[PDB]
Design a protein around this ligand. Structure first.
Ligand code: CL
Ligand code: CL
Ligand code: CL
Ligand code: NH4
Ligand code: NA
Ligand code: NA
Ligand code: NA
Ligand code: NA
Ligand code: NA
Lengths: 212, 219
């Protein structure tokens, strides 16, 4: 049926910037399109209805338009209270569909992470599994390549990452990468290394199994 | 002032049932369309159901047709979502919302529905501070919270006395079907070994709390 394809999935902007978010309908649809803003832990708030009508109380820097089957939400001059996730809605008779959302994040200057590696605990090892954790603390931008090496062999398919939302005070991210091995595989190798790459710099933190 | 207050969410197994309530005030819902919209954790908005005024026509997303029933009791100024034959894909925060302008102008605060097929409390392991920690600088330490189900766990440090520099990561659903996360904190290296650091991990679904003192690994 009807699909609203929202783009981009996220973007970084500065206060004062002009921000454009687009939802493309999969077919011909009515202009019964609304835009919402949503902040973490909170319910959505209606911004625009009927593709282009400003909802009361919503400041005038928000506007909506339509071209063909393209619906667009514009913030003319981004303000600090505007960093949030935005959703479009389309209503056709009873069927209601939403776009998948656009997260609007803040730009700041580049910041290299502090990098830490953590061997598995002896207590976990006796369970038969080894988790090796690499921490990237308070960095910008989010994009980073984190590679695992075990006795200088690049690992694939045995690690997963988690990333925090932008910090409220310094606008940075933090990231964990966890390599998961069986105890038998962990005790077969000696050197464990996490390599963090951003742009022109790579930082590798390592340990040798057994050495303290 | 228009207010919508949801209740009724909680933990339930597949095939089970739950009834959500949406208590309206500041207006009479007999004159408005009302909607239920849900949001799976970390994901977007998804329409669930709608009910029309006066005729009480009901409309449903294909995926809930025949299992969910939307209704309203105008004498209690309250809308309901009766949820039967629940499945894992139904896990979400459920919002009730009032219709306006082909959109939804007032929303409740949401109520959380967690469909769970297992209950398992976490194992907690130390992320011990590096012996290579920069003296006069900063060290990182933490707790690895592994193999629990369902969400959520909460983590504090020193029973809430330590908050600056803490990062508790979003949980990851592992290939095992269980969650894990880490909580970390940066502290002065000079504090290691003479300041106690304890992570407090609470998993209310299993009525389990773990407190783990994280020390430098002895050599
Ligand atoms: Cl591999
Ligand atoms: Cl009907
Ligand atoms: Cl603190
Ligand atoms: N080894
Ligand atoms: Na998004
Ligand atoms: Na939600
Ligand atoms: Na450790
Ligand atoms: Na969590
Ligand atoms: Na101590």
């Amino acid at each position: 049926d009807i699909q609203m394809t929202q783009s981009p999935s996220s973007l970084s902007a500065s206060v004062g910037d002009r921000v454009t978010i687009t939802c493309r309908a999969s077919q011909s649809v009515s202009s019964a399109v609304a835009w919402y803003q949503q902040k973490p832990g909170k319910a959505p708030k209606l911004l625009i209805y009927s593709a282009s009508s400003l909802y009361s109380g919503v400041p005038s820097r928000f506007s909506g338009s339509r071209s063909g089957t393209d619906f667009t939400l514009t913030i003319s001059s981004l303000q600090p209270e505007d960093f949030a996730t935005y959703y479009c809605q389309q209503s056709s008779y009873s069927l209601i569909t939403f776009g998948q959302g656009t997260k609007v994040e803040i730009k700041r200057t580049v910041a290299a992470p502090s990098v830490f590696i953590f061997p598995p605990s002896d207590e976990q090892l006796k369970s038969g599994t080894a988790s090796v954790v690499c921490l990237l603390n308070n960095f910008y931008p989010r994009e980073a390549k984190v590679s695992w090496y075990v006795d200088n062999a690049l690992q694939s398919g045995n690690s997963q990452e988690s990333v925090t939302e932008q910090d409220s005070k310094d606008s940075t991210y933090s990231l964990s990468s966890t390599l998961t091995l069986s105890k038998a595989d962990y005790e077969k190798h000696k050197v464990y290394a996490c390599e963090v790459t951003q742009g022109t710099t790579s930082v590798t933190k390592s340990f040798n199994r057994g050495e303290c | 002032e228009v207010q919508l207050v949801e209740s009724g969410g909680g933990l339930v197994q597949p095939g089970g049932s739950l009834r959500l309530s949406c208590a309206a005030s500041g207006f009479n819902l007999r004159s408005y369309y009302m909607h239920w919209v849900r949001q799976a954790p970390g994901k977007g908005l998804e329409w669930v159901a709608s009910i029309s005024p006066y005729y009480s026509y009901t409309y449903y997303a294909d995926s809930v047709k025949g299992r969910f029933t939307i209704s309203a009791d105008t004498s209690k100024n309250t809308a309901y979502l009766q949820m039967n034959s629940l499945r894992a894909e139904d896990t979400a925060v459920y919002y009730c919302a009032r219709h306006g302008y082909g959109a939804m102008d007032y929303w409740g605060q949401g109520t959380l529905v967690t469909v769970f097929n297992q209950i398992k409390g976490p194992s907690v392991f130390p992320l011990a501070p590096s012996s290579k920690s920069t003296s006069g600088g900063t060290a990182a330490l933490g707790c690895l919270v592994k193999d629990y189900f369902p969400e959520p766990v909460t983590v504090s440090w020193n029973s809430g006395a330590l908050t600056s520099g803490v990062h508790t990561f979003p949980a990851v659903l592992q290939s095992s079907g269980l969650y894990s996360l880490s909580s970390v904190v940066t502290v002065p290296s000079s504090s290691l070994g003479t300041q106690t650091y304890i992570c407090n991990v609470n998993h209310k679904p299993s009525n389990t709390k773990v407190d783990k003192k994280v020390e430098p690994k002895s050599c």
